[PDB]
Amino acid sequence: MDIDPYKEFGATVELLSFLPSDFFPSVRDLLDTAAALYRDALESPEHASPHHTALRQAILAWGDLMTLATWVGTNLEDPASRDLVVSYVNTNVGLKFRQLLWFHISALTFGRETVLEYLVSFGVWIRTPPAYRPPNAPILST
Amino acid sequence: MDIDPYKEFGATVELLSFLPSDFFPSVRDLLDTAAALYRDALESPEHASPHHTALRQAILAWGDLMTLATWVGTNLEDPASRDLVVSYVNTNVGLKFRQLLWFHISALTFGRETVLEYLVSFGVWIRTPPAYRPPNAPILST
Amino acid sequence: MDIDPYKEFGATVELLSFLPSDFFPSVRDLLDTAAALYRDALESPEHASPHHTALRQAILAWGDLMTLATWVGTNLEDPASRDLVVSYVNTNVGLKFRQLLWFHISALTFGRETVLEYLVSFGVWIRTPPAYRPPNAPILST
Amino acid sequence: MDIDPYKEFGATVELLSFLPSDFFPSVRDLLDTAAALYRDALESPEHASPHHTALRQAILAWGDLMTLATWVGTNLEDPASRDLVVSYVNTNVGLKFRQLLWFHISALTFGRETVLEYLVSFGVWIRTPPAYRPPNAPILST
Amino acid sequence: MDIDPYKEFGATVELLSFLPSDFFPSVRDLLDTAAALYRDALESPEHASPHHTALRQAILAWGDLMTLATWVGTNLEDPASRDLVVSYVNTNVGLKFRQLLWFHISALTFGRETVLEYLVSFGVWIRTPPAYRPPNAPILST
Amino acid sequence: MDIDPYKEFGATVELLSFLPSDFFPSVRDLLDTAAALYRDALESPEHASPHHTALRQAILAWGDLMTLATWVGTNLEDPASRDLVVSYVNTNVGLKFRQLLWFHISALTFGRETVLEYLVSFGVWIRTPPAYRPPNAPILST
Ligand SMILES: NS(=O)(=O)c1ccc(CCNC(=O)c2ccc3c(c2)NC(=O)c2ccccc2S3)cc1
Ligand SMILES: NS(=O)(=O)c1ccc(CCNC(=O)c2ccc3c(c2)NC(=O)c2ccccc2S3)cc1
Ligand SMILES: NS(=O)(=O)c1ccc(CCNC(=O)c2ccc3c(c2)NC(=O)c2ccccc2S3)cc1
Ligand SMILES: NS(=O)(=O)c1ccc(CCNC(=O)c2ccc3c(c2)NC(=O)c2ccccc2S3)cc1
Ligand SMILES: NS(=O)(=O)c1ccc(CCNC(=O)c2ccc3c(c2)NC(=O)c2ccccc2S3)cc1
Ligand SMILES: NS(=O)(=O)c1ccc(CCNC(=O)c2ccc3c(c2)NC(=O)c2ccccc2S3)cc1
């Protein structure tokens, strides 16, 4: 079928195309921001909101890809293929767990509605020419 | 942090260790069972229960691994490593999306509570020795 | 437009994908079951339910394809192509009048709701691995 | 059995023999008229009247013949036969989907009873002499 | 995206395909019909109905194309191309502002519902063959 | 007559003269901001507010000019006239669909009243000398 990760949270995968792929912080930073702030809610035995349930899967699905990384680092033959496959998991494949982990850790941190009023307020920033606009891009308010 | 995929649905990842890894139907069967039966509740723009939200991510996360499969099938150098990595995904990492897709497509089809009364009623089956247990293993009732 | 044959009877064409293409009985058998149990309701000058109206067209549309068969059997030049076209009408083209004639002659024979209940009951059967599913697939009850 | 397409709508296939085969507008025009006036009733998931259910099948059955056309245009050997078969589906075979689409499109747009009072009113204007009837054949009123 | 000019006024761009392209009066006539009759509701500083708001844009958008015409008539090099581009605007692109200006100036003069009961009552006119339909085509009543 | 595109939305075409012609983002960006955010409201069969009705025409009118572009790119004789006419459609002619598409996609995105409190709050910025004013121009708040 045609599943969007975001279709029922209030944004489409095309709406997150506003955010350039450089914008999302590194995966090692979001896992810490969620492993050093949400260790009682994520590890808790009862789901809080639809974000916590979607954010377990984002971590665990990334939890298996790293297993794929450590696995491939010790089983292939061609080291170029090893670094080629290991480097491909942290380029485009790792990116889609930067959007996902961002959109949730920024959702249940700044409100499900402040993000969606951020993407619209950030897409309007980048699309503007680099002459008739402010120096800093718009920001998240609690 | 320590995230279990199932901790808030009523079962732990140790509880699903009862089910032997041969038990779970193939991923191509689970995907077709949710695309030919739940093509209205998944694509829909509003989440129904915590299973539908957890089951989008299970499909899409598997949706990216197949992209990793088709990608790796056309970019590596060592074909032996290519197959190794390709088989790997469908070997083990293709397993943890057999438990996940099973536990949900069997949750919101037979009830969130009938599964958990199945694993306990199936773990008690295998536990017994070959020449001690019953013929057919216990089953799911609607 | 995007017309499904089944969209308003309670099932989608993806839902009938559960049934393997070997399952549907032969067209010469369904035309006999309909013509030996649905003559007084089909030939009749007043439609009974939405199945009888959909099942006329299924027979007549198949009534023209056989005319195409008998026509092509006496007008082409290349016998190889003659058979090719003749075998193509009884392979994939004839199949879609096996699903259609099945879903109706099993609808107004066992109830419009027992099929839908059987479709899911049968779909869950095949997807199960061959070890833990019962010997016989689930069945229709009047 | 002996199925008439029209037997339960209020007219027999002999009653439509009044209409000369030149009268029916082209198939590319009725498919547009039905796809430009009935796109929320046909595609809709619930049947409105016995015409909408009979008119899906008329479109889809014609939907497969065009597939036969595009298929035969790329698989036969003798081009003379390819065109012959292609022209055979747009001469006599295509005609019977001009009566059907014409009788179903004028039944839910002018009244299921105004058509049947048209065939009888139009069938008597053709039986009389050319220099006796009105310069125009009788017409449909909403 | 897929925008129809008419999708929310009660008709689709396929529904206006009934009207042959010869039917629409000339643009110089439609512009004079709205400038000598609707010179109070258009220039006015408050929109009356959704037609007046859609009909400003139709005039102004045509207001810029004429500027393109007068511009191109004094800036190109190849006179053949100059005329080609000039004629082009009044050939086809001058047509799609004949449908638009017609459908509105005939909407808010004869009612939004009498037009839509005209296109259906005019498409049924042309559909019929030359020696089968009536003398004068159906007409608009206030 | 004398039609302003904006006269009934709360601003005059002279009021938008504050915005320098460099300010408006490119047409390929606004069509995306409206084709990747308003695909269910614009394509919907019922108009929401006077902006949605004015914004269909802005897209479609631009939809025909691009047809003029692709047309002129394959029919003229003098390639200088081709590039001269094609380049003139994306200079001054394309500009007036940058103001229009801006004023609407910024109207029904930030409120019909926040724009009009922006132009007045932006015209006061540029008119100020480049010495007794802030570094960044004033901005839109949701
Ligand atoms: N903090 S912020 O909200 O991200 C923000 C940061 C910086 C600025 C500087 C000046 N603004 C603009 O030039 C501007 C305004 C409005 C618009 C615009 C550009 N074009 C669009 O195509 C667009 C795209 C998406 C949604 C709406 C729009 S319409 C404003 C806002
Ligand atoms: N249909 S059934 O319920 O699955 C079922 C199938 C087959 C048999 C045959 C003989 N039984 C046993 O040997 C047996 C009984 C009881 C137990 C057992 C083994 N050990 C466990 O570690 C265990 C694991 C989970 C839960 C409870 C237990 S305690 C009984 C029940
Ligand atoms: N009473 S009934 O409706 O006729 C009837 C219902 C159920 C059964 C078989 C039960 N056994 C299982 O091992 C089992 C359980 C659960 C599942 C499963 C197998 N795999 C799937 O891929 C699948 C496919 C579609 C929907 C859910 C699932 S998950 C037989 C009959
Ligand atoms: N506006 S209108 O009602 O459609 C209309 C009706 C009649 C006319 C012209 C004058 N009629 C006749 O010569 C006439 C009369 C009677 C008959 C006839 C022809 N032959 C038949 O074979 C026939 C066919 C069906 C049913 C009865 C009959 S018997 C013009 C218009
Ligand atoms: N004043 S009028 O209503 O416009 C009118 C003018 C002239 C005539 C003369 C003879 N009629 C027909 O041949 C005829 C009748 C019915 C139809 C038809 C053709 N085909 C269509 O595809 C079509 C298209 C749109 C809507 C319905 C239809 S079904 C009748 C009515
Ligand atoms: N975010 S903002 O509102 O665009 C904005 C951006 C930057 C600044 C910096 C300092 N201001 C001024 O020098 C100033 C103030 C007020 C005025 C002014 C200049 N002259 C005008 O002729 C004018 C034009 C239109 C409307 C009112 C006025 S009176 C203020 C506001």
Side-chain angles (χ1 to χ4, degrees), chain A residues 1-5 7-9 31 34-35 39 42-47 50 53-54 56-57 59-61 64-65 67-68 71-72 75-78 81 84-85 88 96 100, chain B residues 1-5 7-9 34-35 39 42-43 45-47 50 53-54 56-57 59-61 64-65 67-68 71-72 75-78 81 84-85 88 96-97 100 112:
Chain A
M1 76 292 288
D2 190 359
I3 301 300
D4 287 332
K7 178 63 71 176
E8 48 87 15
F9 287 143
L31 273 298
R39 244 185 209 198
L42 276 182
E43 282 177 0
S44 175
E46 69 278 18
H47 59 88
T53 298
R56 318 287 185 83
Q57 306 297 323
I59 291 172
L60 291 172
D64 290 334
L65 293 179
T67 297
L68 171 59
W71 186 82
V72 172
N75 295 115
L76 290 178
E77 295 292 328
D78 183 75
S81 67
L84 177 64
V85 163
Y88 161 97
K96 288 186 282 187
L100 185 61
Chain B
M1 76 292 288
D2 190 359
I3 301 300
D4 287 332
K7 178 63 71 176
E8 48 87 15
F9 287 143
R39 185 162 256 181
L42 295 182
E43 292 181 350
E46 69 278 19
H47 59 88
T53 298
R56 318 287 185 83
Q57 306 297 324
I59 291 172
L60 291 172
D64 290 334
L65 293 179
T67 297
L68 171 59
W71 186 82
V72 172
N75 295 115
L76 290 178
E77 295 292 328
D78 183 75
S81 69
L84 185 67
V85 171
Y88 173 105
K96 288 186 282 187
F97 291 97
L100 185 61
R112 179 176 178 176

Side-chain angles (χ1 to χ4, degrees), chain D residues 20 23 33 37 110 122 136 139, chain E residues 14 18 120 124 128 132-135:
Chain D
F23 171 72
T33 309
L37 275 171
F110 289 109
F122 177 85
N136 54 2
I139 63 172
Chain E
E14 293 85 5
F18 287 158
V120 173
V124 68
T128 329
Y132 255 110
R133 50 194 183 192

Side-chain angles (χ1 to χ4, degrees), chain D residues 102-121:
Chain D
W102 174 99
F103 177 77
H104 284 302
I105 289 191
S106 302
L108 44 93
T109 292
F110 289 109
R112 168 178 185 178
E113 182 64 25
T114 301
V115 172
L116 297 175
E117 296 295 330
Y118 175 74
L119 294 182
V120 171
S121 181

